[PDB]
Design a protein around this motif. Structure first.
Motif, PDB file in Angstrom:
ATOM      1  N   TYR A  25      64.620  14.828 -10.907  1.00  0.00           N
ATOM      2  CA  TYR A  25      63.957  14.888 -12.009  1.00  0.00           C
ATOM      3  C   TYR A  25      63.081  14.919 -11.385  1.00  0.00           C
ATOM      4  CZ  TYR A  25      62.573  12.796 -15.800  1.00  0.00           C
ATOM      5  OH  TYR A  25      61.806  13.260 -17.682  1.00  0.00           O
ATOM      6  N   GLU A  26      61.979  14.382 -10.259  1.00  0.00           N
ATOM      7  CA  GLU A  26      60.606  14.211 -10.779  1.00  0.00           C
ATOM      8  C   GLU A  26      60.505  15.557 -10.189  1.00  0.00           C
ATOM      9  OE1 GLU A  26      62.594  12.379  -9.932  1.00  0.00           O
ATOM     10  OE2 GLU A  26      61.308  10.458  -8.778  1.00  0.00           O
ATOM     11  N   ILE A  27      61.580  16.524  -9.415  1.00  0.00           N
ATOM     12  CA  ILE A  27      61.383  18.448  -9.265  1.00  0.00           C
ATOM     13  C   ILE A  27      61.595  19.089  -9.839  1.00  0.00           C
ATOM     14  CG2 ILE A  27      62.960  19.946  -7.392  1.00  0.00           C
ATOM     15  CD1 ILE A  27      63.180  17.455  -5.566  1.00  0.00           C
ATOM     16  N   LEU A  28      62.607  18.856 -11.118  1.00  0.00           N
ATOM     17  CA  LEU A  28      62.398  20.085 -11.582  1.00  0.00           C
ATOM     18  C   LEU A  28      61.252  19.707 -12.985  1.00  0.00           C
ATOM     19  CD1 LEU A  28      66.597  19.862 -12.366  1.00  0.00           C
ATOM     20  CD2 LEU A  28      65.263  21.429 -11.395  1.00  0.00           C
ATOM     21  N   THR A  29      60.575  18.257 -13.000  1.00  0.00           N
ATOM     22  CA  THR A  29      59.633  17.946 -14.000  1.00  0.00           C
ATOM     23  C   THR A  29      57.947  18.578 -13.391  1.00  0.00           C
ATOM     24  OG1 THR A  29      60.636  16.161 -15.135  1.00  0.00           O
ATOM     25  CG2 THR A  29      58.449  16.538 -15.179  1.00  0.00           C
ATOM     26  N   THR A  30      58.088  18.483 -12.325  1.00  0.00           N
ATOM     27  CA  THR A  30      56.533  18.956 -11.187  1.00  0.00           C
ATOM     28  C   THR A  30      56.703  20.507 -11.503  1.00  0.00           C
ATOM     29  OG1 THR A  30      57.248  17.896  -9.429  1.00  0.00           O
ATOM     30  CG2 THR A  30      56.265  16.653 -10.482  1.00  0.00           C
ATOM     31  N   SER A  31      58.212  20.798 -10.841  1.00  0.00           N
ATOM     32  CA  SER A  31      58.022  22.362 -10.314  1.00  0.00           C
ATOM     33  C   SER A  31      58.519  23.466 -11.140  1.00  0.00           C
ATOM     34  CB  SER A  31      59.155  22.284  -9.140  1.00  0.00           C
ATOM     35  OG  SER A  31      58.578  23.574  -8.137  1.00  0.00           O
ATOM     36  N   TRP A  32      57.866  24.584 -11.565  1.00  0.00           N
ATOM     37  CA  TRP A  32      58.608  25.489 -12.485  1.00  0.00           C
ATOM     38  C   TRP A  32      59.468  26.315 -11.231  1.00  0.00           C
ATOM     39  CZ3 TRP A  32      57.597  26.450 -17.839  1.00  0.00           C
ATOM     40  CH2 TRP A  32      56.274  25.786 -18.408  1.00  0.00           C
ATOM     41  N   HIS A  33      58.986  26.439 -10.704  1.00  0.00           N
ATOM     42  CA  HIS A  33      59.764  27.474  -9.464  1.00  0.00           C
ATOM     43  C   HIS A  33      61.652  26.702 -10.080  1.00  0.00           C
ATOM     44  CE1 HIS A  33      57.270  30.573  -8.465  1.00  0.00           C
ATOM     45  NE2 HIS A  33      55.652  28.992  -8.639  1.00  0.00           N
ATOM     46  N   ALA A  34      61.554  25.723  -9.579  1.00  0.00           N
ATOM     47  CA  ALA A  34      62.741  25.131  -9.679  1.00  0.00           C
ATOM     48  C   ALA A  34      63.830  25.084 -10.641  1.00  0.00           C
ATOM     49  CB  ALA A  34      62.433  23.663  -9.245  1.00  0.00           C
ATOM     50  N   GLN A  35      62.940  25.046 -12.117  1.00  0.00           N
ATOM     51  CA  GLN A  35      63.555  25.442 -13.405  1.00  0.00           C
ATOM     52  C   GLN A  35      64.108  26.712 -13.424  1.00  0.00           C
ATOM     53  OE1 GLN A  35      64.510  23.820 -15.425  1.00  0.00           O
ATOM     54  NE2 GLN A  35      63.517  21.665 -15.401  1.00  0.00           N
ATOM     55  N   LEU A  36      62.723  27.843 -12.723  1.00  0.00           N
ATOM     56  CA  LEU A  36      62.765  28.876 -13.073  1.00  0.00           C
ATOM     57  C   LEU A  36      64.043  29.752 -12.407  1.00  0.00           C
ATOM     58  CD1 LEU A  36      62.536  32.254 -14.055  1.00  0.00           C
ATOM     59  CD2 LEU A  36      60.415  31.915 -12.169  1.00  0.00           C
ATOM     60  N   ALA A  37      64.639  29.248 -11.340  1.00  0.00           N
ATOM     61  CA  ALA A  37      65.657  29.289 -10.191  1.00  0.00           C
ATOM     62  C   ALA A  37      67.317  29.364 -11.206  1.00  0.00           C
ATOM     63  CB  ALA A  37      65.225  28.714  -8.930  1.00  0.00           C
ATOM     64  N   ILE A  38      67.204  27.658 -11.139  1.00  0.00           N
ATOM     65  CA  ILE A  38      68.325  27.453 -12.278  1.00  0.00           C
ATOM     66  C   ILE A  38      68.772  28.611 -13.383  1.00  0.00           C
ATOM     67  CG2 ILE A  38      69.394  25.659 -13.636  1.00  0.00           C
ATOM     68  CD1 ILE A  38      67.379  23.832 -11.800  1.00  0.00           C
ATOM     69  N   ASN A  39      67.362  28.244 -14.789  1.00  0.00           N
ATOM     70  CA  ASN A  39      67.177  29.475 -15.520  1.00  0.00           C
ATOM     71  C   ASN A  39      68.028  30.546 -14.838  1.00  0.00           C
ATOM     72  OD1 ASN A  39      66.431  26.836 -16.033  1.00  0.00           O
ATOM     73  ND2 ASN A  39      65.077  27.366 -17.523  1.00  0.00           N
ATOM     74  N   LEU A  40      67.108  31.433 -14.327  1.00  0.00           N
ATOM     75  CA  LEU A  40      67.816  32.650 -13.755  1.00  0.00           C
ATOM     76  C   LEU A  40      69.199  32.446 -13.754  1.00  0.00           C
ATOM     77  CD1 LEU A  40      64.693  33.965 -11.995  1.00  0.00           C
ATOM     78  CD2 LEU A  40      65.881  35.449 -14.348  1.00  0.00           C
TER      79      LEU A  40
ATOM     80  N   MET B 239      71.769  30.451 -14.362  1.00  0.00           N
ATOM     81  CA  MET B 239      72.489  30.873 -15.700  1.00  0.00           C
ATOM     82  C   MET B 239      72.374  31.755 -16.314  1.00  0.00           C
ATOM     83  SD  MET B 239      73.338  28.094 -14.308  1.00  0.00           S
ATOM     84  CE  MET B 239      75.274  28.046 -14.372  1.00  0.00           C
ATOM     85  N   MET B 240      72.019  32.126 -16.837  1.00  0.00           N
ATOM     86  CA  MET B 240      71.000  33.607 -17.479  1.00  0.00           C
ATOM     87  C   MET B 240      71.744  34.562 -17.477  1.00  0.00           C
ATOM     88  SD  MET B 240      69.236  33.138 -20.251  1.00  0.00           S
ATOM     89  CE  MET B 240      70.030  33.581 -21.650  1.00  0.00           C
TER      90      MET B 240
ATOM     91  N   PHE C  24      70.405  40.594 -11.148  1.00  0.00           N
ATOM     92  CA  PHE C  24      69.377  40.774 -11.615  1.00  0.00           C
ATOM     93  C   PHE C  24      68.913  39.546 -11.266  1.00  0.00           C
ATOM     94  CE2 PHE C  24      69.241  45.734 -11.270  1.00  0.00           C
ATOM     95  CZ  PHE C  24      67.826  45.541 -10.146  1.00  0.00           C
ATOM     96  N   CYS C  25      69.396  38.863 -12.792  1.00  0.00           N
ATOM     97  CA  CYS C  25      69.064  37.533 -12.797  1.00  0.00           C
ATOM     98  C   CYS C  25      69.408  37.106 -11.713  1.00  0.00           C
ATOM     99  CB  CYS C  25      69.541  37.133 -14.022  1.00  0.00           C
ATOM    100  SG  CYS C  25      68.866  37.986 -15.313  1.00  0.00           S
ATOM    101  N   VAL C  26      70.636  36.924 -10.568  1.00  0.00           N
ATOM    102  CA  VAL C  26      71.117  35.723 -10.116  1.00  0.00           C
ATOM    103  C   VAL C  26      69.833  35.994  -8.616  1.00  0.00           C
ATOM    104  CG1 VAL C  26      72.990  36.137  -8.417  1.00  0.00           C
ATOM    105  CG2 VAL C  26      73.587  36.081 -10.917  1.00  0.00           C
ATOM    106  N   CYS C  27      69.781  36.878  -8.868  1.00  0.00           N
ATOM    107  CA  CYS C  27      69.085  37.314  -7.241  1.00  0.00           C
ATOM    108  C   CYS C  27      67.303  36.878  -7.052  1.00  0.00           C
ATOM    109  CB  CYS C  27      68.959  39.031  -6.877  1.00  0.00           C
ATOM    110  SG  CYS C  27      69.483  39.292  -5.618  1.00  0.00           S
ATOM    111  N   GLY C  28      66.915  37.147  -8.926  1.00  0.00           N
ATOM    112  CA  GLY C  28      65.948  36.510  -8.963  1.00  0.00           C
ATOM    113  C   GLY C  28      65.618  34.644  -8.964  1.00  0.00           C
ATOM    114  N   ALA C  29      67.121  34.166  -9.415  1.00  0.00           N
ATOM    115  CA  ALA C  29      67.435  32.522  -8.905  1.00  0.00           C
ATOM    116  C   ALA C  29      67.137  32.353  -8.047  1.00  0.00           C
ATOM    117  CB  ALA C  29      68.799  32.300  -9.570  1.00  0.00           C
ATOM    118  N   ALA C  30      68.164  33.111  -6.955  1.00  0.00           N
ATOM    119  CA  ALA C  30      67.665  32.915  -5.404  1.00  0.00           C
ATOM    120  C   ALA C  30      66.098  33.066  -5.005  1.00  0.00           C
ATOM    121  CB  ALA C  30      68.802  33.609  -4.098  1.00  0.00           C
TER     122      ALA C  30
END
Ligand code: CLA
Ligand code: CLA
Ligand code: CLA
Ligand code: CLA
Ligand code: CLA
Ligand code: CLA
Ligand code: CLA
Ligand code: LHG
Ligand code: DD6
Ligand code: DD6
Ligand code: PQN
Ligand code: SF4
Lengths: 161, 188, 40, 47, 741, 183
Positions: E331-346, E348-349, E389-395
């Protein structure tokens, strides 16, 4: 005339190519009704095709056995318009371009911030250099004679042989 | 606590400025566009719309009666007809030259040249040359133009709705009795 | 159109795009008015 | 040509119809430049 | 509390930093001294966390960038609608969808390109489109061009509003990090407020405007005579005439007699026989049910009031014996870091884009889209590519989080720590899986080629020599075929006719057909699995070994993207997680290319085609997939060579643009190999020779020219490789499908 | 409340040209402020050159409709068509002579940096004054302002004649008569 090619005006294959293109356009014309924008556009296009073929016939281009114009680039003045005159035109234009670039570089190197002037172009003087590069052949010759064009190589970086 | 003099149940906003820097400040800004846009830009737009609406309503009313010999079109179809003829292209060209110069002035005024919102300096006849009359004439200009916007809107809309030339009034309003007192039926 | 925006328009990529735009338009208009010039 | 004032009248009176019923909404909406298909196709520049 | 808290006028509005090009970064703000500065200005443009340390400032920049992107997307929706309004034949297609080729683009006559305005039917000359927007608008109920024009104007207004919002939320009133970190309220509003109300509004639009217009169009009413949507919206008598349940009003809704709305809210399933697409009543019921589901889901997380969940507590409560502390710290990781959220969201997208590709072709949702064979192929292939492309962006962004925002003090003994502590086991086992899967799946093809060349069809892995039947897929297909009676009694038809059932056909062309699965399908599916597994190997290894490795214990110190760590240790080349992404992009490219080739050949040979009055099913290629897809020679002959005819023979026709793009994409694919194989040292020495030539003439620039950096050369090679390959496939598919279908 | 407004436009700020010693500098007409970007001396040189060329060109245009060189080949009252009608060698010789004149008059001074290096060089003062009107300094300001204004009017006028002949297809005064003819 030369290379076994014949003038395009008296070329049976050239005439058939023209006729075939015309028949193709008229065949596709069947879909559209009279007076519509598509019909008028196709009429303009077929007029353009006929005008193009007539212009090639009149210009004196030589057509081969394939029935397409073949440009003779050997320096004969009968076919000067194929390469020699376009060649001179491009050489003048490219010289204009390179002289504008070089003269602006010579200006910018003396500026207090040449590195920033390279990105941000001083447009008021860039326009002046571009305009003044119209007489590059005399300007380049003048710089050659005065010795301010080719830096002595004893002054250019060179890698250890 | 300063309440807007046009809406005394709302506090003045803030971005409207000091009460009275602009002639006509009755504090009318319920939606608070002054927070988003700058007041000088908004006032330049206001005076441009005022002047254009004045000229437009007068031209509409005039063309309803009189037209030049070449242009034999009614006011509604005049726009299409003179685009086909080419006159509206000329109007667009010249008004666009004037508007490019105007836009340069707006840019300078917003960047801080000192020009007032809509002061182009156009004063040949000398109206408002005396400073005492200048504020009153600005207020009169604004009042007349703000009226003229609604005037032109009513002109065009009623003209298309009715199909009548000057009054923009239905046939029953023009012919029948709009001050009747004997009991009316279902239709006018 | 402050001096800063004039400087930004004078930056290298904007100037490249503007000049190549004018050049391409010049070439295309020359094509429209003198089309199919496989010769001089 | 007709110079207005020299070889022709100046302002000319306009032609008008003496009153009339309300045109139906579909009468002018179907010809309007923004709420008609043909109106939209005709509301384009020309050259 | 969850509250709105923003700072006012945080950044002034001025062009001074427009003029200053490299202002965003400390190193770039100095000015240029080499041409690498110019490239770095673009490379570090959107790396906000490298520019500014403040998470608040990073969040504000991201928020306004999202606004700018939405403005661009609204302008794009506007271009689609406006081109359909003006430069199209939408009315002609609406009158006669099957014969009219959809077209919404027109070229100008300048240099002979006017031929590209080909015959597209309807008395219109233009470039045929394959985006399905015509079918989308027909589903939406648009029947006039004024509607398209006005929605385009609305889209332009929304784009202007979005530009204004982006400017306002960074220059006038920027939120705070406290506002940004309200993840619970964000989830609540995105579930109930964005998704839920979006679905509810679309369901209302369908029920009120799309069902009547489409039903009348299917009945036969021409678009001119169709009552307008505003008339339909409030004329309850007409809506009762069309759907009798409407005469009962909303009382059957407020009371729970929802069965009264069975006519216009259905669970029919299958495809509409007229349009050969999904039932719009089914779609309306679908969107209504999803609106209810999302509004129900959006009331889960805590807010100003006592009710609700805390995602922190939910995560912390999940910890097992084999996981130690479990999800603590995430929770703290995903609230503090935008890159983790971007990884997960990319991630799933991208998976959603792929799932969209798989679903749309099997269940054509828009009318007359199934018969529009170019549209189906184009949409499937496009969404597959976007998904990869989105999956590789996630990675990539997972690796970026690992390099930058990872911290053991936070993530001690949690799942991230435990994953890093046996990354070696993970990668070794995935390596074995990749070797095994590739060996089997490809060596079956190679065996088939060998035996065919040796003249031994009896020794093939064919459907008649040594069968490898997908028994489980066949069983699942049978279950789906029998579902409408037993396990879905209220369904009147199967979800998709691909599993089984009747042959849906509109006019002569075939909309949907049962897709058989045999030995070739088994082989190509295992090929797909192998390609996916190798891509996951590369990307997961890059993410796991971004911190360090046995080769470089201090890989995190060097950074996320760096060229190397020298020629030592035998060579430390492409050790970076960035280079791992660079290699994984080739592999997802290969994966998606094989997937789209499978789709194209299978649908052309087994599904798409024509059916006569008696029922003579004649496919485009003639069912050659089942017997020719068993060999790589057959793949090379009966798919690439056979179907490249419509591309190469396109010169002198409207598809000649596709021919030119075929060649150009080939050229760019080959041009990429220069960057991919070559190295900066040679190029810098060549630039030194050229710089001597310039210095001899007194024109060597003040900004000294340099060969591109190593990472930049890899990036340029990858970009050109992807562009060339994707453009080659794009031109090939479009030319082939437009010519034959 | 502009502190230093343009004289021509009180609603725009003073351009650099307004605060200059050129003839006609007391007008301040530069809405695009191209005097800031362009060197004012170069711009005035070009202004006077274009004005002189066009105030020759307007007289040539109006008098070519009426008068002809006796028996000159390819005459047409419409000068647009007459350019193509006339021999190309005539125009080639004219362009060659004007090239010689420009080259010799601007020897080593063909560019912004090159020209006006010497302080005595004035914009437009190419030394052409056989009759020596400039020796009388009292009328020099009058003649300079008159040259500038008439050149400007002639640039505009030549554009007018050229585009009117494009519109109508007939020469200038023929089109003028057709405008000022009977309804
Ligand atoms: C300022 C302009 C300029 C000038 C005068 C020259 C001059 C030269 N270059 Mg070129 N060069 C330039 C820009 C210029 N270069 C740029 C920007 C690049 C990077 C792409 C190169 C890359 C380059 C290479 C790799 C090579 C040369 C070579 C050469 C020589 C042969 C001419 C040739 O074939 O050009 C080739 C021209 C190009 C490849 C493209 C030129 C790019 C554009 C069209 C021109 C730039 C104009 C500039 C924007 C003007 C701004 C001025 C304005 C503000 C007023 C010659 C010394 C060759 C050599 O060494 O021969 C001995 C050689 O191998 N050049
Ligand atoms: C918003 C301003 C506006 C606009 C957009 C138009 C537009 C039009 N007018 Mg004009 N018109 C206007 C104001 C306007 N008018 C005013 C204020 C008057 C009263 C003098 C007129 C009187 C008028 C007449 C009598 C006719 C037109 C006509 C037309 C059409 C052709 C242009 C023309 O000859 O104009 C002529 C415009 C003028 C003579 C006014 C010039 C003065 C302006 C407003 C500036 C004043 C301040 C300096 C065109 C649709 C013609 C048409 O097609 O009619 C069917 C036509 O016959 N207009
Ligand atoms: C060059 C051609 C020309 C000439 C010689 C005239 C001459 C005349 N026009 Mg004009 N007129 C012209 C073009 C011309 N017009 C054009 C192009 C238009 C369209 C905008 C008009 C529109 C027009 C109207 C609507 C009327 C006249 C009228 C008149 C007469 C009244 C004079 C007057 O009040 O002047 C006043 C002029 C000025 C105060 C100066 C304006 C012009 C300068 C250059 C600015 C006069 C004989 C009137 C008429 O018919 O009287 C019987 C009249 O009512 N004219
Ligand atoms: C019902 C309320 C609501 C709605 C409708 C939205 C909608 C949106 N939010 Mg969210 N958001 C909400 C409440 C809401 N938010 C709350 C309470 C918070 C604070 C916790 C946030 C915090 C937040 C952030 C931090 C971000 C968003 C963003 C977005 C966009 C996501 C991308 C997308 O698919 O756009 C779909 C777009 C549309 C459907 C077009 C509609 C456009 C307007 C609303 C009309 C979207 C427009 C992202 C963004 O900035 O994107 C621009 C983003 O980064 N929101
Ligand atoms: C968000 C989605 C949505 C929306 C916007 C609507 C809208 C509507 N539905 Mg509903 N509907 C929906 C989802 C939606 N539905 C769903 C999911 C279902 C399936 C369960 C249904 C099932 C359904 C049925 C079965 C029926 C409706 C009907 C209606 C109407 C109800 C009127 C009403 O309650 O006024 C609410 C009134 C107020 C809140 C008071 C304010 C009143 C304002 C001021 C009036 C404004 C009027 C307008 C601007 C001018 C009109 C002028 C006219 C001359 C053109 C309206 C058109 C009825 C209908 O008309 O069907 C055609 C109807 O019978 N709906
Ligand atoms: C939600 C989507 C999303 C978001 C918000 C971001 C955001 C970010 N990414 Mg990216 N990324 C994405 C998707 C996304 N990415 C995807 C799908 C991939 C997989 C390819 C990547 C792979 C990736 C890597 C590997 C890296 C980033 C990095 C970054 C950061 C800086 C990027 C930058 O400044 O580029 C500025 C923009 C450019 C340089 C222009 C890119 C132009 C491309 C390459 C070509 C465009 C071709 C065009 C479409 C067609 C041409 C046609 C032809 C005919 C002319 C930034 C945080 C970097 C980072 O975080 O470093 C620490 C980084 O190293 N991203
Ligand atoms: C056709 C070209 C090709 C081939 C054959 C391979 C092969 C491989 N790549 Mg890939 N790769 C390629 C192109 C190719 N790559 C390209 C262009 C790139 C650059 C982007 C990469 C980048 C790359 C990376 C970065 C990775 C791979 C991986 C792998 C391995 C996958 C495991 C596997 O299935 O092995 C099995 C072998 C095959 C499928 C080849 C055919 C085998 C059959 C059965 C023939 C057997 C013959 C016989 C037994 C021996 C010879 C007989 C006689 C002469 C003695 C494998 C070594 C991944 C890996 O390590 O996987 C664990 C990995 O991480 N590749
Ligand atoms: C295929 C790989 C299976 C072997 C690796 C799984 C090893 C594994 O991940 O550890 C076991 C792990 C469950 O661990 P716990 O119950 O400790 O963790 C539950 C977590 O959700 C709490 O953090 O996952 C599974 O059981 C998946 C089993 C494979 C299905
Ligand atoms: C003031 C103001 C603004 C404004 C404004 C506006 C809207 C101004 C509008 C002005 C307007 C509406 C001015 C019309 C003139 C018409 C003329 C001269 C007609 C010529 C007509 C000619 C020469 C000929 C007509 C013919 O029929 C003749 C006689 C013979 C026939 O054979 C055919 C032809 C066609 C040849 C800004 C800039 C927007 C903002 C600023 O803040 C405030
Ligand atoms: C300020 C100054 C001076 C000055 C001055 C003066 C008098 C300046 C005058 C300038 C002047 C008089 C400038 C006209 C421009 C006209 C244009 C652009 C017309 C375009 C016309 C067009 C594009 C027409 C198009 C169409 O016809 C087409 C092709 C076909 C038709 O279907 C449609 C229409 C009709 C639309 C002095 C006194 C000389 C010196 C002093 O020191 C400084
Ligand atoms: C061709 C090539 C070059 C030379 C290519 C360069 C420098 C690209 C040139 C781009 C400029 C901006 C020209 C673009 C076109 C216009 C002339 C401007 C490298 O520097 C390089 C570096 C590292 C690995 C591989 C390579 C590589 O393959
Ligand atoms: S070529 Fe590149 S990756 Fe290989 S050792 Fe040199 S710098 Fe490192």
């Amino acid at each position: 005339d030369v290379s076994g090619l014949t003038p395009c005006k008296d070329s049976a294959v050239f005439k058939k190519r023209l006729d075939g293109s015309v028949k193709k356009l008229q065949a596709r014309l069947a879909n559209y009704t009279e007076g519509t924008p598509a019909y008028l556009a196709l009429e303009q296009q077929i007029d353009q095709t006929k005008a193009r073929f007539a212009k090639y016939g009149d210009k004196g281009l030589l057509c081969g056995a394939d029935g397409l114009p073949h440009l003779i680039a050997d320096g004969r003045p009968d076919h000067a318009g194929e390469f020699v005159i376009p060649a001179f035109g491009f050489l003048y234009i490219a010289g204009w371009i390179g002289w504008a670039g070089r003269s602006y570089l010579q200006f910018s190197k003396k500026t207090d911030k040449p590195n920033e002037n390279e990105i941000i172009i001083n447009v008021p003087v860039a326009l002046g250099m571009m305009s003044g590069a119209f007489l590059w052949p005399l300007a380049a010759w003048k710089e050659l004679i005065n010795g301010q064009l080719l830096v002595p190589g004893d002054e250019v970086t060179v890698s250890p042989r | 606590v300063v309440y807007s003099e046009a809406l005394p149940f709302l506090v003045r906003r803030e971005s409207l400025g000091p009460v009275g820097a602009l002639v006509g400040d009755v504090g009318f800004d319920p939606l608070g566009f002054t927070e988003i846009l700058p007041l000088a830009w908004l006032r330049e737009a206001e005076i441009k719309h005022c002047r254009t609406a004045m000229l437009a309503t007068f031209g509409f009313a005039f063309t309803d009666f009189w037209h030049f010999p070449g242009f034999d079109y009614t006011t509604l179809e005049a726009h299409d007809a003179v685009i086909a003829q080419g006159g509206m292209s000329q109007l667009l060209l010249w008004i666009g030259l004037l508007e490019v110069f105007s836009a340069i002035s707006i840019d300078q005024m917003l960047r801080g040249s000192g020009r007032e919102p809509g002061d182009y300096g156009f004063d040949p006849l000398g109206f408002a040359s005396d400073p005492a009359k200048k504020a009153d004439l600005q207020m009169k200009e604004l009042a007349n133009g703000r009226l003229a916007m609604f005037a032109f809107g009513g002109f065009v809309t009623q003209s298309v709705l009715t199909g009548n030339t000057f009054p923009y009034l239905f046939d029953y309003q023009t012919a029948g009795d709009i001050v009747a007192i004997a009991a009316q039926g279902a239709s006018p | 159109m402050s001096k800063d925006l004039l400087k930004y328009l004078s930056t290298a990529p904007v100037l490249l795009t503007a000049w190549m735009s004018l050049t391409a338009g010049m070439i295309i208009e020359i094509q429209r008015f003198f089309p199919d010039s496989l010769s001089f | 040509m007709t110079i207005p004032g020299l070889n022709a009248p100046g302002l000319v009176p306009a032609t008008k119809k003496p009153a009339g019923a309300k045109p139906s909404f579909e009468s002018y909406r179907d010809t309007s430049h923004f709420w008609s298909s043909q109106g939209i196709m005709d509301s384009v520049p020309k050259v | 509390k969850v509250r709105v808290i923003v700072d006012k006028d945080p950044v002034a509005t001025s062009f001074e930093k427009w003029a200053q090009p490299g202002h965003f970064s400390r190193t770039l703000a100095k000015g240029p001294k080499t041409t690498t500065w110019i490239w770095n200005l673009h490379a570090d443009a959107h790396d906000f966390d490298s520019q500014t340390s403040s998470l608040e400032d990073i969040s504000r920049k991201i928020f306004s960038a999202h606004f700018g992107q939405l403005a661009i997307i609204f302008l794009w929706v506007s271009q689609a609608y406006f081109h359909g309004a003006r430069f199209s034949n939408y009315s002609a297609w609406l009158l006669n969808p099957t014969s009219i080729k959809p077209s919404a683009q027109v070229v100008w006559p300048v240099v002979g390109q006017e031929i590209l305005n080909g015959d597209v039917g309807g008395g219109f000359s233009g470039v045929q489109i394959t985006s399905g927007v015509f079918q989308m608008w027909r589903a939406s109920g648009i029947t006039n061009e004024t509607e398209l024009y006005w929605t385009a104007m609305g889209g332009l207004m929304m784009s202007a509003l979005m530009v204004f919002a982006g400017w306002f939320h960074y220059h006038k009133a920027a939120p705070k990090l406290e506002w940004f970190q309200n993840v619970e309220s964000m989830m609540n509003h995105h579930l109930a407020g964005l998704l839920g109300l979006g679905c509810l509004s679309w369901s209302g639009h369908q029920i009120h405007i799309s069902l009547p217009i489409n039903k009348l169009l299917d009945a036969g009413v021409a678009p001119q005579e169709i009552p307008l949507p505003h008339e339909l919206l409030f004329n309850q008598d007409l809506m009762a005439q069309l759907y009798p349940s409407f005469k009962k009003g909303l009382l059957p809704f407020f009371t729970l007699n929802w069965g009264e709305y069975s006519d216009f809210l259905t669970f029919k399933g299958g495809l509409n026989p007229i349009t050969g697409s999904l039932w719009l009543s089914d779609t309306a019921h679908h969107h209504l049910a999803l609106a209810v589901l999302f509004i129900f889901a959006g009331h889960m997380y805590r807010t100003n009031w006592g009710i609700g969940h805390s995602m922190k507590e939910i995560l912390e409560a999940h910890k097992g014996p084999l996981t130690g502390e479990g999800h603590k710290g995430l929770y703290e990781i995903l609230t503090t870091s935008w890159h983790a959220q971007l990884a997960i969201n990319l991630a799933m997208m991208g998976s959603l884009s792929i799932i969209v590709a798989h679903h749309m072709y099997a269940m054509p949702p828009y009318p007359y889209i199934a018969v529009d064979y170019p549209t189906q192929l184009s949409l499937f292939t496009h969404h597959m590519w976007i998904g990869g492309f989105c999956v590789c962006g996630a990675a990539a962004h997972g690796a970026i989080f690992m390099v930058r925002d990872y911290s053991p003090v936070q993530s001690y003994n949690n799942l991230l720590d435990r994953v890093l502590r046996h990354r070696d086991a993970i990668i070794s086992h995935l390596n074995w899986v990749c070797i095994f899967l590739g060996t089997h799946s490809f060596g079956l093809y190679i065996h088939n080629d060998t035996m065919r060349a040796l003249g031994r069809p009896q020794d093939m892995f064919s459907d008649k020599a040594i069968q490898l039947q997908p028994i489980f897929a066949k069983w699942v297909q049978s279950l789906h075929t029998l579902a409408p009676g037993n396990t879905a009694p209220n369904s009147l038809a199967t979800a998709s006719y691909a599993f089984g059932g009747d042959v849906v056909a509109v006019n002569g062309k075939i909309a949907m057909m049962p897709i058989q699965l045999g030995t070739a399908d088994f082989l190509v599916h295992h090929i797909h699995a192998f390609t996916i597994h190798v891509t996951v190997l590369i990307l997961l290894k890059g993410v796991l070994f971004a911190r360090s490795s046995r080769l470089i214990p201090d890989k995190a110190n060097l950074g996320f993207r760096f060229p190397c760590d020298g020629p030592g240790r035998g060579g430390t080349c492409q050790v970076s997680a960035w280079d791992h992404i660079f290699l994984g992009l080739f592999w997802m490219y290969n994966c998606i290319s094989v997937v789209i080739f499978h789709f194209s050949w299978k649908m052309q040979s087994d599904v798409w085609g024509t059916i006569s009055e008696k029922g003579k099913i004649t496919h485009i290629t003639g069912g050659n997939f089942a017997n020719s897809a068993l060999t790589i020679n057959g793949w090379l002959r009966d798919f690439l060579w056979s179907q490249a005819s419509q591309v190469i023979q396109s010169y002198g026709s409207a598809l000649s643009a596709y021919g030119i793009i075929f060649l150009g994409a080939h050229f760019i694919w080959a041009f990429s190999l220069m960057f991919l194989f070559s190295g900066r040292g040679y190029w810098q020495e060549l630039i030194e020779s050229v710089v001597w030539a310039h210095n001899k003439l007194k024109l060597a620039p003040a900004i000294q020219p340099r060969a591109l950096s190593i990472t930049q050369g890899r990036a340029v090679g990858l970009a050109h490789y992807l562009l060339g390959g994707i453009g080659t496939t794009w031109s090939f598919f479009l030319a082939r499908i437009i010519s034959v279908g | 409340a502009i502190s230093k407004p343009s004289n021509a436009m009180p609603f725009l700020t003073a351009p650099p040209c307004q605060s200059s010693k050129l003839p006609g500098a007391e007008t301040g007409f530069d809405p695009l402020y191209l005097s800031e970007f362009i060197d004012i001396k170069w711009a005035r040189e070009a202004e006077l050159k274009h004005g002189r060329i066009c105030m020759l060109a307007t007289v040539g245009y109006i008098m070519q409709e009426f008068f002809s060189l006796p028996g000159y080949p390819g005459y047409t009252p419409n000068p647009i068509e007459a350019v193509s009608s006339t021999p190309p060698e005539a125009l080639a010789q004219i362009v060659l002579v004007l090239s010689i004149i420009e080259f010799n008059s601007n020897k080593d001074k063909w560019t912004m940096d090159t020209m006006f290096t010497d302080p005595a060089r004035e914009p437009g003062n190419l030394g052409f004054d056989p009759l020596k009107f400039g020796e009388n300094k009292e009328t020099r300001e009058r003649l300079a302002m008159a040259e500038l204004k008439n050149g400007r009017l002639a640039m505009i006028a030549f554009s007018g004649m050229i585009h009117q002949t494009f519109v109508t297809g007939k020469p200038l005064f023929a089109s003028l008569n057709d405008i000022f003819s009977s309804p």
